[PDB]
Write a protein that binds this DNA or RNA. Structure first.
Ligand SMILES: Nc1ncnc2c1ncn2[C@@H]1O[C@H](COP(=O)(O)O)[C@@H](O)[C@H]1O
Length: 631
DNA sequence: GCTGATGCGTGTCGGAC
DNA sequence: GTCCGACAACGCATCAGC
């Protein structure tokens, strides 16, 4: 019986402990029961084993449901490049919860805010049982609804789900819709569970499967080593082809050992990009890299563009998160013939697209880039031009370069591609181990409109193998260095969600405007404090809660705090940059008549226990800092 | 026809292991 | 170090209300 389904039990048997009949649809309650057992524990290894048990039963009994169960576990709707999104947030969701439970919407909103979780409100307040594929399909139905009256149609589907929910299902339906499943298990653990499941219980056997536990005859050491090896086969393939729609049919038909024979890196199919680990100083860079020669490059402030040229000439462009951006950049597309030597027949390039001012011939801020339209059919209508800064080459003329060292990938990039100023340029770079030269290069990068340096080894562990290490590169920014900040007043707090439930998750901060003697909201703040500090803030600020705002506190367009606070606490906050804000009033009129100023990537540093609000950073100082950054 | 509100999509940080 | 999920500013696109 699905109500008693226990994928965390000892001696889990994929056949005998499943809670549905062979070949029938996996019930959604089996998924919900699995989620309960996963969120109850903190050790990822234990979460992986529990999910693996569900997956082995899916493989053994009902293999067509493997793909929807995996998406439900990731809370994804499909492969990233297809771009389906629910179009559902707390607004649509709580209205649906309110109507399903028959309660007033304010009562539902208030309880969800206090509890920090929509799932508990949806649950604790005729139709056939939900199935995993049925729920997944309805989720995709919600995402495809568009046009006038689509909100009411989305709500109707959601109410239909809640009406059919049993036991714990409503909790997880609502958390999924809210984007906050909170399992503690995400992409890497799902892949580990999948490789473990298909290794222990191979797909494609006639029911009942003759092989239920392929690890039974191995010592514990041989079992661990084997599962690690199978797990790396799945992880390397997925990093090249992060698309379960392609992988799972192949896995089900040919098994995991033969997977790389059928799914490999190829132009037109986005791959996982290499990411960067933040490093807090040049000395820390030499420590992570030890003896290995490395290169430093400008870290451009734009958007990543993974540019694919297929054999035959089709070009596709993907984002860092593998969204299809091809329709966004008809200007890039028309430029491709200019950037390659005539011998290049296909490639995958790793680049940064940066807004570029063709009148002044210079880079423009990230903010300017974000004003491009999402779709543009005529390059003629484009107003924000872009320059591509190329820094890697992943595939060339039919061959993957993923196992080549950066020294060779970079040489192939420079040898086979053609620069045009203001259109396509190789990232500015420096090969050195001299601490003083690196420090000056870091300074120069900021003067040249970049946010810092990327650092990459050239020959030691210098490949593009994301499954081996996804953060193989280092990012170095001046704002990571100690002593290289603003003192702001806490004027409000926001109730925490999830891991912050039951305390404050965020705070509203303000600068002191000397001329009006008012406090002006400047940004929110929600990271940089330890768990212990955040509880201390909850305890000390609760004494300062007020029913109504003070008349000298101005927040204009900011989110109204859940709790207004008597202005008293002053905190030191660090940011990457200041920005001209559409909503915050701080220093409005000092630089821009209509816009005040906010903080890019603010983080809490420490309490200024001995600073009164009137001695906080002033709005005039905020303006001065913004002007200094703006040349 | 306009607009404000909602949703999606483009970093820093600490905890458990 | 890895994995995960708290939380930031601010843009476009969309849609309900007007
Ligand atoms: N020279 C460069 N090499 C690699 N990434 C770069 C470079 N310049 C800018 N970037 C961007 O920096 C991001 C890496 O930082 P992060 O996303 O913080 O891991 C990439 O996704 C790129 O969009």
């Amino acid at each position: 019986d699905p109500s008693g389904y226990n994928p965390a039990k000892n001696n889990y048997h994929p056949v005998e402990d499943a809670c549905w009949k062979p070949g029938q649809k996996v019930p959604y309650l089996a998924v919900a029961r699995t989620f309960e057992k996963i969120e109850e524990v903190s050790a990822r290894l234990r979460m992986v084993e529990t999910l693996s048990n569900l997956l082995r039963s899916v493989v053994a009994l009902s293999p067509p449901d493997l793909l929807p169960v995996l998406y439900l576990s990731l809370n994804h709707l499909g492969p990233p490049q297809q771009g389906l999104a629910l179009g559902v947030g707390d607004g649509v969701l709580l209205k649906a919860v309110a109507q399903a439970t028959g309660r007033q919407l304010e009562s539902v909103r208030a309880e969800a805010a206090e509890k920090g979780d929509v799932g508990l409100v949806a649950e604790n307040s005729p139709p056939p049982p939900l199935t995993a594929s049925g729920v997944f399909s309805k989720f995709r139905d919600i995402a495809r609804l568009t046009g006038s009256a689509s909100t009411a149609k989305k709500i109707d589907i959601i109410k239909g789900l809640f009406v059919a929910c049993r036991h714990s299902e409503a909790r997880f339906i609502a958390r999924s819709l809210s984007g906050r499943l909170r399992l503690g298990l995400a992409e890497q653990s799902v892949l580990a569970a999948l490789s473990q499941a298909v290794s222990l219980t191979p797909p494609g056997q006639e029911f009942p499967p003759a092989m239920v536990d392929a690890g039974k005859g191995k010592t514990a050491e041989a079992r661990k080593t084997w599962l690690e090896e199978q797990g790396m086969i799945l992880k390397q393939t997925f990093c090249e082809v992060p698309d379960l729609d392609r992988i799972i049919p192949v896995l089900l038909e040919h098994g995991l050992e033969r997977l790389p024979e059928h799914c490999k890196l190829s132009p037109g199919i986005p791959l996982k990009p290499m990411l960067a680990h933040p490093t807090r100083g040049i000395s820390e860079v030499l420590k992570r890299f030890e003896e290995a020669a490395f290169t430093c490059e400008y870290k451009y402030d734009g958007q990543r563009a993974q540019i694919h040229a297929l054999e035959g000439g089709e070009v596709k462009i993907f984002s860092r998160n593998q969204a299809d951006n091809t329709g966004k950049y008809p200007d890039i597309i028309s430029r491709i013939p200019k950037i390659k030597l005539p011998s290049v027949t296909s490639f995958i390039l790793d680049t940064e697209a940066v807004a570029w001012d063709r009148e002044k011939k210079q880079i423009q801020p990230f903010q300017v880039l974000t004003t491009r339209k999402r779709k543009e059919v005529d390059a003629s209508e484009i107003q924000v031009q872009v320059c591509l800064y190329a820094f890697d080459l992943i595939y060339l003329n039919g061959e993957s370069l993923v196992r080549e060292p950066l020294s060779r990938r970079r040489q192939l990039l420079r040898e086979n591609f053609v620069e045009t100023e203001g259109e396509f340029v190789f990232a500015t770079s420096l090969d050195t181990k001299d601490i003083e030269q690196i420090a000056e290069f870091l300074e120069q990068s900021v003067k040249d409109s970049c946010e810092g340096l990327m650092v990459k080894t050239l020959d030691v562990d210098a490949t593009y193998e994301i499954a081996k290490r996804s953060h193989n590169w280092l990012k170095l920014k001046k704002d990571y260095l100690d002593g290289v900040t603003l003192d702001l007043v806490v004027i409000g707090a926001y109730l925490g969600r999830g891991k912050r439930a039951g305390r404050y998750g965020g705070f509203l901060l303000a600068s002191y405007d000397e001329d009006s003697e008012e406090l002006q909201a400047i940004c929110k703040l929600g990271t940089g404090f330890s768990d212990e500090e955040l509880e201390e803030h909850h305890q000390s600020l609760k004494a300062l809660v007020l029913p109504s705002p003070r008349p000298y506190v101005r927040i204009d367009g900011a989110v109204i705090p859940d709790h207004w606070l008597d202005p008293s606490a002053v905190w030191e906050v660090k940011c990457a940059d200041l920005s001209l804000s559409p909503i915050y009033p701080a220093a409005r009129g000092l630089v821009d008549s209509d816009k005040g100023i906010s903080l890019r990537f603010p983080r809490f540093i420490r309490v200024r226990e001995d600073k009164q609000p009137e001695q906080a950073t002033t709005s005039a100082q905020v303006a001065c800092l913004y002007r200094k950054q703006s040349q």
